[PDB]
A = this chain, B = another copy of it.
């Protein structure tokens, strides 16, 4: 079972998604992609970038946001254990108490998440990774990495090789 469900809404920049595929494979997360993507999906490019088949073969691809909600049995209005990562959020990523299988939703690199998705979530389900005043948002793949490793830490790193 998926440590976390990492959900990218209309991702734009190929290397970010490539980095996230690698991250999810290393940590036991299930990656979900919501179309339209800003790049064309291509098995051959993913392999050339160094990704192994089993890293990308089992990614879930969703036609649109409501189809993602329906597929994952998330209540469209008040979705269970869905958190949106946004600079517009309230709690820090480390202030949420994660559970296995939580859904973590990230926006596109240029636009961020649409207003109708954020306006429908309560403040406590919109997570802001801390940044200094005046900052440029995070790189998308860095944002995902930070939240994934924080959640995994809280969970006691289930599935990690021990040293």
Contact = CB atoms under 8 A, between A and B. Distances in A.
Contacts of A53: none
Stoichiometry, as copies per complex, reads: 2
B149 A132 contact: no
A160 B87 CA distance: 12
Interface residues of A, number: 41
A124 interface: no
Contacts of A108: none
A90 B130 CA distance: 28
A141 interface: yes
Contacts of A132: 25-28, 159-161
Interface centre among A90, A136, A137, A152 (most CB of B within 10 A): A136
Nearest to A146: B149
